[PDB]
Amino acid sequence: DRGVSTFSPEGRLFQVEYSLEAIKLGSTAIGIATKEGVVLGVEKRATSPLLESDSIEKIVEIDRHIGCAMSGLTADARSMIEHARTAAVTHNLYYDEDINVESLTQSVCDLALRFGELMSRPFGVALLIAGHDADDGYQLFHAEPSGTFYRYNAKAIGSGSEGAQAELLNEWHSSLTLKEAELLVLKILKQVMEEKLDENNAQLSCITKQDGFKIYDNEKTAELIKELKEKEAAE
Amino acid sequence: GYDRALSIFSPDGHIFQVEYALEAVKRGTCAVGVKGKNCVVLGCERRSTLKLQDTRITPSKVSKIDSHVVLSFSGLNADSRILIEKARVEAQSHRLTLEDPVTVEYLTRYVAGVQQRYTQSGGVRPFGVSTLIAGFDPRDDEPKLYQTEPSGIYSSWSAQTIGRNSKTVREFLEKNYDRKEPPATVEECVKLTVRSLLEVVQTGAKNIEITVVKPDSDIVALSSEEINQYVTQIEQEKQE
Amino acid sequence: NNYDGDTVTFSPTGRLFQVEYALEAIKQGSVTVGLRSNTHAVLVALKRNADELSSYQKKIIKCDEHMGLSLAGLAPDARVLSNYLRQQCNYSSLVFNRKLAVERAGHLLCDKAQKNTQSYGGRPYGVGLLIIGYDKSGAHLLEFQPSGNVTELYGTAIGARSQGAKTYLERTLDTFIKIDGNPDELIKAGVEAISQSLRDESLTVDNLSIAIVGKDTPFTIYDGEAVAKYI
Amino acid sequence: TQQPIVTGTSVISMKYDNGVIIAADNLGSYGSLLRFNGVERLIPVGDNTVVGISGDISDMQHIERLLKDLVTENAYDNPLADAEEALEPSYIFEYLATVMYQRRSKMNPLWNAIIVAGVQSNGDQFLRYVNLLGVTYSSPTLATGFGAHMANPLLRKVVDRESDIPKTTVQVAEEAIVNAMRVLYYRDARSSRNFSLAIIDKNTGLTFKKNLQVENMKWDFAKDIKGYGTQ
Amino acid sequence: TGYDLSNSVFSPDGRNFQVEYAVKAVENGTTSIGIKCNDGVVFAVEKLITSKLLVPQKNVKIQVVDRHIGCVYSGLIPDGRHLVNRGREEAASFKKLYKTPIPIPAFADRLGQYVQAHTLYNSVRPFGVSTIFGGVDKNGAHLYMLEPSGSYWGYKGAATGKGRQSAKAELEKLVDHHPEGLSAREAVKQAAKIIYLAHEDNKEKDFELEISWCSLSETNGLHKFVKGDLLQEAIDFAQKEIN
Amino acid sequence: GSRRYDSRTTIFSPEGRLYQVEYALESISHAGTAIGIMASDGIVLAAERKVTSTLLEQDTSTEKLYKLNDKIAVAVAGLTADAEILINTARIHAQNYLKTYNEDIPVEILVRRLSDIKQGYTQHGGLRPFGVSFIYAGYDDRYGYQLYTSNPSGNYTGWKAISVGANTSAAQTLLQMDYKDDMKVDDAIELALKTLSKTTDSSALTYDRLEFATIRKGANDGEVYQKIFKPQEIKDILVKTGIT
């Protein structure tokens, strides 16, 4: 065989590059940042109709001001979330304040490359970390298993990512409202999803300064879905 | 200490050791879980190539984790003991610190976390086991049924099956199980479970195990004659 | 070929291929430039983005009030090494009440990267660094490579198409070395140098990144509207 | 937890217009027994610092080795080891200060009181104290043991505050030190007549004087004293 | 086969191919030399000027161990630094326990055992440097040369790097023509010449000369760099000899 | 480094099998056959020694049958050296339980722990598994007389009658035919010997190529006795059943 921390001739870590392929197989997750808030939405993708879809937890709270959506080998994310939550609360204990969204993301990304021959392999999951703080306001980050993170105005990860990213490129502007951003996530999710989009197989969430991080109910999302279909038919 | 990274990614983005662990689960004897309106029933297959067995002392397929939660499995039997043991210890630890027994979701989450840890730890291979964890939360009458697998993912099911020929019995349950109206009584739920196993098993003699779990730590295992009555009743109605 | 499985193996011609592959990761990285006079030392770094919706990857890191670097390659590896430099700079302050010499800073990085190239299990660092600083012997500029080789220079550049900026500085050597007591003009020379490595793209407001240290100037970084002056 | 065995008494020092003076007798006491008479308790570090040490001599000799080893370590990979990157008094002090406090914090102290006297590279006079507890302080005059009680009062009549330092010449300052050493010989039961003195001037550099003696002593009035009252 | 893939594996010859491969890295490097003299030793090295952008005199390659030992090497520069860092630890522990500064032969074995240790396991890589070192101790002057295998001997003169054969030939003439001995100041001038003569084997890029020395009379038994007037005098002597 | 030479003993095949466990079982299938039969009033352990030489000291020998405590014994099939490592661990575990609870260890508990040790070698440590299969014969006051078996996988199961080692397929068919639930010990002794006599690869079954043991309540009133058969005692029981 060969080493776990080996470089390829092109100057890339084999294991990190292979973990990126696993993330492409994962379910779609989209995030959009606005001045009124940041929205996070995911494709649940139940493997069978007998599976109770409400138990599929792919959107997750880290703190009251930071949320998280995932894509790929979702089991790997549990320890990442656990670390993130501990980091956030620990900083709150030491400094009597909320922790910056960038600092939280950086803390999570420090785990990424702690593998070799430490854990045995990289994480097989990508994260969209959305939040708000007083300094840099509403922020959306994309955290990879390479240890790298980019801030985004909007970002899609998972199987329908490249198709959705091209759609976000056209649709995003710096004056989007929250209601507009909610519909835009639903619109783009319905386009890339295999099965027909409804309240049971897709989930929405947002983070605002006032109310903090909230996962939407199936009743609330259903009305946004109905509002979306009517507006598209209206022209 | 033995450090080797046994579970690693491949060019196509797969962790083969985890996927090969799923093959061990597919080889294992069938196990089924069906939850009704006020109960959950765990059915299990027992292969009949083993006669001259001592059923008194032979390890039973369904295991109590606490007085209110149970765990059945499919895959490597030796591996399952290690998960069950850890789960039983965590169950007592939770009662000790929180002063309340575990929820079925929490216990499942713990067991799944262990399975996951063995997919990215050095010197260890993944568990060749998938589990069905069922029960009732403390002071709660809503039935709970969960499933775990070697990768570490877990989820809740209205009804579910794992093991060999599980795709056949899952097909049966998908059309026979109504979400709007689950099995109203214990008899109805047990019958549907036995029916689903009879699609795969062979004979309804000493091949099927049934364990009924009801609220407030009310768990009982059915005997041969009791199960045989369901087998006799189903076959007579079938001839129509 | 058969001798690139790990860093502990030499090739028949006496090469370490894993170290060379780590060197390759730097060439893929975005361009960055370093230069100095006798009074000031300047870093100029072209930041890179994933797409128009994304931010621009931050290239420059501060290590102390009098020292910092710019990176090219694996960013996490730059974070590990810069963190180590921050600790060493800080150890020098707490224990000896002494600002760490830029030359020693280089020696310490060299010895850290080396240990990774001689032991089984580990890997070489996949990043190149340009360290600038002002200490008791004036301004300094260092070039770090993950092979371990550290080099003190008047000017240099690393990353993709860095040869364009490096040639310009080799011509301009006599001019920019004597830009003493003038920060803006030394930056202008650095911005003109990095421009020789540009293709199709040009320097925009949220693309360019500049840092400076000097005689009466702490290590500070300029981004956003603060670098609009130099476009 | 220690108890000091072979011990050294007072170390005295002061600043003057161009530098600093420091002195300490050549005795190694073993309780009340005046065991060793050829003990040098002033130890120069480079050509710009002198460390004066009192207390346990075994611990003094350990500190000697640490300083000796510090000069060696500083020379490593340092072309400016005898120039810009030479060891400063402030660097030498902070190192010892760190050690002393770390040792007290492990309940295993170096049973000493130390005074680091020297001149900095910019011409500034350096004088600072540190002891077994890690306690540090600076003052125009500094003294250990009995020196603190007897020498300081005399030395503070010459330099009472900061503004008195430019007004004090090396002749005046050395006279005050030599006088203080005589007073200590009169009154300290663990002191000797033989001592060493060191001057670190910003112009003339390091002057180390050995085998000095206390002289011009007043003893003649003793003959007139009788009994203890009546007699 | 496959005997050359792993370190510490004997080939059917009885050879460790990984060590011989490390020697190739040494041969690839710049030239460095050592000259033993009447009451001390002289070290010199070739520094290739890759670019105009290199600061002259400010990329020092010769390293001091303790206060009396000089070390220079050819090959993987980082590997050389690692070895000197160990040497400095070894010399420090010797002086800590035994008081006296470490003798040169004693020091030589400390490096020798450490380099040899890196040929015993597959989990470590052999050193990619040949190290010329020495100094003055109680028994007089000593010059040594240490190789990737851990092999070292005492030398009258020593040379390694890309221009080793040219330098070796020039060193052999000095041993023959000066049987009674060579002086310390002479050895500095000769060292300059031999580096310049050895530069013919690396003449694409022009170079920078760097010399150091230990001498009982001239440097008082301590390691010092040759700088200023004495350096320029040695360069002029070398320049006059090539023409 | 050393990665090159690692066999990777604790991994899965593409089919979801443990290579080393499967191969260890292949090893055990060549070992001398051992049989266990459980009756209502006792248990029988019978085993066939591996190709005996005439100059082998038979009376002062122990290859197949081992005593774990006063109430529990095991029959071995595989590497003897491996088994003895495990047997000493089991012997210690039984004494720890007695020391802790002042009660002899229940049979299933001892079997589980020994099986858990084998499991460990298949999941972690990077070492080869124990090439051993046991037949546990024991008694306690909860389940009475019990027969178990464990293999290198660490999986254990309970039995009324069971064989391990060579020719188990043939042996298990013969046991399945003639066994019944109301059986006595003396009948089970006869069955055990008859089964070995038909499955043996040797020309004829003799006293010098057998180890034999019983666990009866044949002591005086409500107590269990372990009888490891002497050479002469095996000779007599072989004549009594009419095999020689």
Place this chain on the structure above:
Amino acid sequence: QFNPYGDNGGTILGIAGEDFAVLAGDTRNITDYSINSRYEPKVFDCGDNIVMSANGFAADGDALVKRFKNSVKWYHFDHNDKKLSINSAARNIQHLLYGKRFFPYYVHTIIAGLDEDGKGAVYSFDPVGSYEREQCRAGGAAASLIMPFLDNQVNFKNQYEPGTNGKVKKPLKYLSVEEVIKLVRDSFTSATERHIQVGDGLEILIVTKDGVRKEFYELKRD
């Protein structure tokens, strides 16, 4: 037996205004009955408009200030040059002190600066990390002399409105920087008179939005 603690004497004082805050401390350092230094500062600018003093055992005091200064440095590295707020600095110091709960720093710590609303702030600590924001605090050897004077003059304790039959209290109001420095100087001259470990010199560090200013005043040298 070795005793790892000592008493270096002196005393410190913190007062908060509406848009400013002061932290004062004498410059005298002592052991037993000897003066070590007549000018040895123990009130330090720690950056981010935070001044700090840790009075008592100077070795522990210097060690703590040195660690907090270092804590501020790493806060900037780890959180994008964010300004450390006074409340955050306080909580951080609690963990530094409590970190040695079972082998304490023998110091009474006081920090001063501005809160996030721009208003003056003084936090004070016990040796093991207990802290509380106040308008007013004196610490160290002569704390017992100065503190009650501050209660009376800064917080107007025991002062009622004349002619109101001791029913209406004297209303609370902020003090000007001029009035505060007057109280500081009087507090230290009074303490110098009656406490032997206090004297030589007085150094005050004033903190406004503009920065950190210093003022020095002579004290009696006996």
Place this chain on the structure above:
Amino acid sequence: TTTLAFRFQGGIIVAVDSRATAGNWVASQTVKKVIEINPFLLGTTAGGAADCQFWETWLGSQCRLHELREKERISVAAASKILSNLVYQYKGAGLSMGTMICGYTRKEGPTIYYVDSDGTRLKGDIFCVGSGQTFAYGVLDSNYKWDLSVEDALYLGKRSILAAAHRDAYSGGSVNLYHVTEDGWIYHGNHDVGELFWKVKEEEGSFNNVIG
């Protein structure tokens, strides 16, 4: 210190003094001895100040992590046990803590737990903790009924602290009141003993031992 909290018809009353001491030296008169862990949990401090302050704040972090992990507010029982198990690990080292964990949850209802630094953990309806606990007990016990109104219960708690503040030399400053209901805790103000004493004396006609 003096701290109390008692259960009654209308929920839980919690009352504390505000004095800190360093021997006979009054270190502070304005100290907060009630830690607000969450909108439904309170924690009272008595004993070593840093010990209480540090570890109850730490407790708040552990309770936050619980509700993040479990998606549900921590039970009063579990919260109290985290703290009691922590101090038990330090038993013998010299921690000094007298705490009361008070709160409401759906499954428990209003609940009070006494926890101290030698590991004692007790559920109960009435507790008084601190140097002046005995003085508070005297007034509280003699006036306590389950059927007290919210108005009367608040006053009894305030009056009990006042009683102890007066007699106990190591208690005083001011009274901090809290009321815990099914809807969460409600702060009922800071009450300076300087004014409160004379107000109570006059209106209630009590404290006849003092020169009026």
